[PDB]
Design a protein around this ligand. Structure first.
Ligand SMILES: Nc1nc2c(ncn2[C@@H]2O[C@H](COP(=O)(O)OP(=O)(O)OP(=O)(O)O)[C@@H](O)[C@H]2O)c(=O)[nH]1
Ligand SMILES: Nc1ncnc2c1ncn2[C@@H]1O[C@H](COP(=O)(O)OP(=O)(O)CP(=O)(O)O)[C@@H](O)[C@H]1O
Ligand SMILES: Nc1nc2c(ncn2[C@@H]2O[C@H](COP(=O)(O)OP(=O)(O)O)[C@@H](O)[C@H]2O)c(=O)[nH]1
Ligand SMILES: [Ca+2]
Ligand SMILES: [Ca+2]
Ligand SMILES: [Ca+2]
Ligand SMILES: [Cl-]
Ligand SMILES: [Mg+2]
Ligand SMILES: [Mg+2]
Ligand SMILES: [Mg+2]
Ligand SMILES: [Mg+2]
Lengths: 422, 303, 54, 436
């Protein structure tokens, strides 16, 4: 039933804030928490993401976390800022200096119990907690380091619940600091072990889409985030509205995750076009140029796939188009998981669109993204470059070595299953 | 585009059919075990018919009829003819097959050679040969002989049955002459005489023609055998569809009566005909079900 | 084509027509199964918590 | 009069159950408030319909049913729906969190928690019975509840009611409407554990039902509501003999006697005709609807009986039918169709006629017909469905895909192989009785 949402660090709170703006709209909840929609579909499964207060107010079951008050002051000022439970803002002053170790071991260690207190209070009001979703980047310090610390601690206290993340991967094309590969590699290590599902959001990919497709000369974090929140709306549609397929976090995981470590998903959205038939959606959503992870699916194989169409359209035409892409490109789907492409339809489209499709792929191509971060990590680590920022926080080199090793292992695991035949 | 899989790498005929489908640029050959296929060119034995026609959105077609073995097994065929009222215990064009007959025939001097496989005049001689399942059928004894040579032969005809159960007789047949080309290879021919020439001989030596003296009977026999098992094997309203290529083997006696020897469910072809037949297969059996983008038939439709 | 056992009620009838003559665990063991599976879950949960404590 | 208790497990079992009871009510003139005007002995009696409905002193007619699901969404609909007054709250049982399409989770983890409550509720229905026949159990193969909880229940039902008959109505997984990739695992697992406990199981392949709904009701994209209304007709035909005066299949133990010579080979093929779009007719005759019982396109499971052997065959007509017309229909069919029985059984047909035509839901997708038939035939051809399923199982299991989810819930990996080997033996059994 209920999901508990956490957002951590600058990136995490920025996409987190947009996500609530978007879905709050779809569910007809204005910034005061009041409902004003013209349908029951909106309020039928609203309890998955919103608590109910008196006056029929709806309050996001969301927890905002940062080691620095900057971004959370910005969110409290933003459009929907007043909607969040003010008690659910949890923040330090020191910041994390884009340093995983500070978020995970020092600055973050000091703040984490305050967060878990709010996490707990929110879980105790839940009729039947599904699990948690966290939004964050892997390239910084708070979202990356403290975010994964939160996840481990959450798992210790709720070991039989589902842990789901939206993780923004760093790219040189859109980079804040040189140590992003370090922070990301350290974080992936945690994710491989402690999440059930991770939507890999590649900033490289978001940029290429804003630039080459949307024809935006100067993509901004605002643009990048519009894509992300639209994707986030799409991938959670099944959890928020009436539906048979992947209707909750555990059923999604059972359908999408054949092997416990291989739970990194390549999302996609359509339409995306610069300044609309069911075939059009279907071709675009499967198009490499539409993937929010910078990987070529034609370089790997799909283990499993979920597709969510939204709006009024022909179910018959949906089924047809899907079965075509699938039966026409059947080489890219593994033969040893029969019928591994599942489709859902929801009648309510996102704001401003007649219809849209969201794609969620578990492709072995994803190894490209990890191999990329591993190459960047290794270029520096050979020379122990910039290590002092981390050893100065108590970390040892050996811990970097293990993270590297484990991520390299994950990559080898994806290759194994890319070569497997019936 | 269309997709197919190949599960009999030994089939001479369909090896050529796959070659043409590919050379159409509208057919993709998928891997042996990819189930998302339009067309299966199946394995000669233990074809998994049970798994056909259950792939949503795919029209599936296969190049064998389930149950057609009832015609293509020596022993099965005999049972079928004997016990099937429209073929009947007493059928004109099939040699008695399986003692009471051995008596009658060796009651008078008139008789009495029988061949057996899975030839002799003494029963016990090969009846012991067996034990040391088979069928015993009268060895025509009075074959029609070719001159020059004074030699025996047999006729092979190729029949394509499509998904609608239309019965198509390939206009080209061959005579295997002196009988198997495997035994013999171990006359301006190559031990293979075709219709152009054999019709001429018939006109020359017997003042008759191929159509009249022999082909009529062949058509009748083919139409009779296949109409008989139609209700058992037809895929008319089935969740998948079948077509299949058969080879019928005939013997002609000296009175120009045609005799059915057997039917093969997996026939080869005359080297020189592979081109024409195989193209016909893709035309009538495959392209009929899976049409392409944007004659003079080589087949005689039997009805 | 012998027709036998023809029974007639006010709501219909039934009969048989012939064409040709004829040519486990205890409550105990279940409970053990479920309890053994339960212990296995507990062991796995204990290994995880131990790992998390490290 | 011996009672029958129905048990609906999981979404599919519950939703099909819903449609069946709706139909039963319509067929007997029971209103949703529970009153039955045509019924004259207020608060009791031993009429035929009483095998499915008990009665209160107020004249309410109450299904002898239990609804069970590990999550409350589907059952909540029963609680608030058209027929909410029919059911006593103790008959509807829900957990908080479902089996997540995981047999192990439904069977071991969550099943253990809720089994005793379910058995208590069933006992409460049993104690109200003067002479219980046994149970009819509706569930999917693919769902974690339908597969896993159902098999635990069936084992426990054998313990508490060893002398009782147990019949299944089982939904066999079809990708067309499938909500999970692991449904083949759940199917083999549940079949392995339930085999020794079920006396007769009627499989309904969603693929078959789907296609009949598209082809004959001109429905472009069938919903569960379309599927279930058709399925309910088939079930109603099968259970009619228990709920109406008749002489064929009049108690549960007779379903086995007439259809199941070999205990393990207990899956009869169901074939139904005519299915006619209500959105359009020329009424089919006895000959025709009977001939249609041999067309694969009308079967609950798509397979080819021509390439198998029959062990038994019942014909169940509803409406305007007399024996004369049936025998004549058969004669003609015997000579135009391929119908080979196992040579150690008589080549025949047990035939049941009920003069009341099928009933249809007002404003449904089915047209009223004057006569219909459902053929139950125990043929070896249905093993095709086992072979397809076992094949999909082998593809995933060879790489252990998804296996961690089941081990994770406390099941041993070894149970996968026991289950698969039992199905291999089951395919072997069909092979022998059916192949020359
Ligand atoms: N015919 C029909 N099939 C259904 C229906 N509901 C679900 N199914 C099928 O049943 C399978 C899914 O299993 P469910 O019954 O929904 O799962 P469950 O028993 O509730 O178990 P959980 O996993 O815990 O929810 C799939 O093959 C569905 O297509 C229904 O109402 N009618
Ligand atoms: N009853 C018979 N009378 C005369 N000749 C016969 C005969 N039965 C078989 N033959 C001869 O033996 C040859 C092959 O026999 P047969 O067809 O029965 O076995 P076969 O199956 O080895 C090869 P194929 O299957 O390609 O025909 C024929 O060409 C024919 O000349
Ligand atoms: N897509 C996106 N990426 C961001 C945003 N803000 C920061 N990033 C990325 O996140 C990383 C920096 O982490 P950040 O969230 O700012 O640090 P933190 O506060 O310590 O967690 C870099 O990889 C940035 O490219 C944002 O709003 N959107
Ligand atoms: Ca401090
Ligand atoms: Ca009464
Ligand atoms: Ca028993
Ligand atoms: Cl008992
Ligand atoms: Mg920053
Ligand atoms: Mg020959
Ligand atoms: Mg042969
Ligand atoms: Mg369900």
């Amino acid at each position: 039933r209920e999901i508990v949402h956490i957002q951590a660090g600058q990136c995490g709170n920025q996409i987190g804030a947009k996500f609530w703006e978007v879905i709050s709209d779809e569910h007809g909840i204005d910034p005061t928490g009041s409902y004003h929609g013209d349908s029951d579909l909106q309020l039928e499964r609203i309890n998955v993401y919103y608590n109910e207060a008196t006056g029929n107010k709806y309050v996001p079951r969301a927890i905002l976390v940062d080691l620095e008050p900057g971004t959370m002051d910005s969110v409290r000022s933003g459009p929907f800022g007043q909607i969040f439970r003010p008690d659910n803002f949890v923040f330090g002053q020191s910041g994390a200096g884009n340093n995983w170790a500070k978020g995970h071991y020092t600055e973050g260690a000091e703040l984490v119990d305050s967060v878990l207190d709010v996490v707990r209070k929110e879980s105790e009001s839940c009729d039947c907690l599904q699990g948690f979703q966290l939004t964050h980047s892997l390239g910084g310090g708070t979202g990356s380091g403290m975010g994964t610390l939160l996840i481990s601690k959450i798992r210790e206290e709720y070991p039989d619940r589902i842990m789901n993340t939206f993780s923004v991967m760093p790219s040189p094309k859109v980079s804040d600091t040189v140590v992003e590969p370090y922070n990301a590699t350290l974080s992936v290590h945690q994710l491989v072990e402690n999440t059930d599902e991770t939507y890999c959001i590649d900033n490289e990919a978001l940029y290429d889409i804003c630039f080459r497709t949307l024809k935006l000369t100067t993509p901004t974090y605002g643009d990048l985030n519009h894509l992300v929140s639209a994707t986030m709306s799409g991938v959670t549609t099944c959890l928020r509205f009436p539906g048979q397929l992947n209707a909750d976090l555990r059923k999604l995981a059972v359908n999408m995750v054949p092997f416990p470590r291989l739970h990194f998903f390549m999302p996609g959205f359509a339409p995306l076009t610069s300044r609309l038939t069911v075939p059009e959606l279907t071709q675009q959503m499967f198009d490499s140029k539409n993937m929010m992870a910078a990987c070529d699916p034609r370089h790997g194989r799909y283990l499993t796939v979920a597709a969510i169409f939204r709006g009024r359209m022909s179910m018959k035409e949906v089924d047809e188009q899907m079965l075509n892409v699938q039966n026409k490109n059947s080489s890219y789907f593994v033969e040893w998981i029969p019928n591994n492409v599942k489709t859902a339809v929801c009648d309510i489209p996102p704001r401003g669109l007649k219809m849209s499709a969201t794609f969620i792929g578990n492709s072995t191509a994803i190894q490209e993204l990890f191999k990329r971060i591993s190459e960047q990590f290794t270029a520096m680590f050979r020379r122990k470059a910039f290590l002092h920022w981390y050893t100065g926080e108590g970390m040892d080199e050996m811990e970097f070595t293990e993270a590297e090793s484990n991520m390299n292992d994950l990559v080898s695991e994806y290759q194994q299953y890319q070569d497997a035949t019936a | 585009m269309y997709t197919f899989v190949v599960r009999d790498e030994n089939s001479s005929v369909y090896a050529e059919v796959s070659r043409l489908l590919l050379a159409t640029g509208q057919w993709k050959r998928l891997r042996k075990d990819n189930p998302r296929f339009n067309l299966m060119l199946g394995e000669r034995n233990r074809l998994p018919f049970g798994r056909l026609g259950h792939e949503p959105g795919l029209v599936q077609l296969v190049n064998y009829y389930r149950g057609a073995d009832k015609l293509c097994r020596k022993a099965s065929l005999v049972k079928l003819i004997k016990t099937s009222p429209e073929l009947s215990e007493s059928c004109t064009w099939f040699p008695e097959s399986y003692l009471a007959a051995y008596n009658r025939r060796r009651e008078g001097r008139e008789g009495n050679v029988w061949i057996a496989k899975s030839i002799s005049s003494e029963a016990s001689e090969l009846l012991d040969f067996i034990d040391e399942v088979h069928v015993i059928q009268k060895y025509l004894e009075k074959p029609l002989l070719l001159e020059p040579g004074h030699r025996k032969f047999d006729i092979r005809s190729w029949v394509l049955v499509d998904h609608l159960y239309n019965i198509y007789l390939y206009r080209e047949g061959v005579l295997r002459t002196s009988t198997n080309h495997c035994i013999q290879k171990e006359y301006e021919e190559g031990n293979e005489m075709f219709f152009e020439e054999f019709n001429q001989y018939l006109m020359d030596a017997l003042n008759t023609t191929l159509e009249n003296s022999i082909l009529l009977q062949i058509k009748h026999i083919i139409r009779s055998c296949l109409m008989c098992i139609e209700p058992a094997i037809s895929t008319k309203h089935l969740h998948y569809q079948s077509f299949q290529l058969f080879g019928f083997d005939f013997m002609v006696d000296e009175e120009l009566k045609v005799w059915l020897i057997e039917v093969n469910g997996a026939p080869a072809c005359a080297q020189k005909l592979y081109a024409e037949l195989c193209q016909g297969i893709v035309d009538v059996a495959i392209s009929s079900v899976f049409p392409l983008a944007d004659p003079t038939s080589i087949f005689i439709k039997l009805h | 084509m012998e027709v036998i056992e023809l029974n007639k009620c006010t709501s219909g009838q039934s009969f048989e027509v012939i064409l040709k003559p004829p040519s486990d665990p205890s409550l105990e063991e279940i409970q053990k199964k479920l309890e053994a599976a339960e212990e296995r879950r507990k062991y796995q949960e204990a290994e995880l918590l131990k790992h998390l404590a490290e | 009069m011996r009672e029958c208790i129905s048990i609906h497990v999981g979404q599919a079992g519950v939703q099909i159950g819903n449609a069946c009871w709706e139909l039963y009510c319509l067929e007997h003139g029971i209103q949703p408030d529970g009153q039955m005007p045509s019924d004259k002995t207020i608060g009791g009696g031993d009429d035929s319909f009483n095998t499915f409905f008990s009665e209160t002193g107020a004249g309410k007619h109450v299904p002898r049913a239990v609804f069970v699901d590990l999550e409350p969404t589907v059952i909540d609909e029963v609680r608030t729906g058209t027929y909410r007054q029919l059911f006593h709250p103790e008959q509807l049982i829900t957990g908080k969190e479902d089996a997540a399409n995981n047999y192990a989770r439904g069977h071991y983890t969550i099943g253990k928690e809720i089994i005793d409550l379910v058995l208590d509720r069933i006992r409460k229905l049993a104690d109200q019975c003067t002479g219980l026949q046994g149970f009819l159990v509706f569930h999917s193969f693919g769902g974690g509840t339908g597969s896993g909880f159902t098999s635990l229940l069936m084992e426990r039902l054998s313990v508490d009611y060893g002398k009782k008959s147990k019949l299944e109505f089982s939904i066999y997984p079809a990708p067309q409407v499938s909500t999970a990739v692991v449904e083949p695992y759940n199917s083999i697992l549940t079949t392995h554990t339930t085999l020794e406990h079920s006396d007769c199981a009627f499989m309904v392949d969603n693929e078959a039902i789907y296609d009949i709904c598209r082809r004959n009701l001109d429905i472009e994209r069938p919903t569960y509501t379309n599927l279930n209304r058709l399925i309910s007709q088939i079930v109603s035909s099968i259970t009619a003999s228990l709920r109406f005066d008749g002489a064929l299949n009049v108690d549960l133990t007779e379903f086995q006697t007439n259809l199941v010579p070999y205990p393990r080979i207990h899956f009869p093929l169901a074939t139904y005709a005519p299915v006619i779009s209500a959105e359009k007719h020329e009424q089919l005759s006895v000959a025709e609807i009977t001939n249609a019982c041999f067309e694969p396109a009308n079967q609950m499971v798509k397979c080819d009986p021509r390439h198998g052997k029959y062990m038994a065959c019942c014909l169940l007509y509803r409406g305007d039918v007399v024996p004369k017309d049936v025998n004549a229909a058969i004669a003609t069919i015997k000579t135009k169709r391929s119908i080979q029985f196992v040579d150690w059984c008589p080549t025949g047909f047990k035939v049941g006629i009920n003069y009341q035509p099928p009933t249809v839901v007002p404003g449904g997708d089915l047209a009223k017909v004057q006569r219909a038939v459902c053929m139950l035939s125990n043929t070896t051809a249905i093993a095709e469905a086992w072979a397809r399923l076992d094949h999909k199982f082998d593809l995933m299991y060879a790489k252990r895909a998804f296996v961690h989810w089941y081990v994770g819930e406390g099941m041993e990996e070894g149970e996968f192989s026991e289950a698969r080997e039992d199905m291999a033996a089951l395919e072997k059994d069909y092979e022998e009785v059916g192949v020359d």
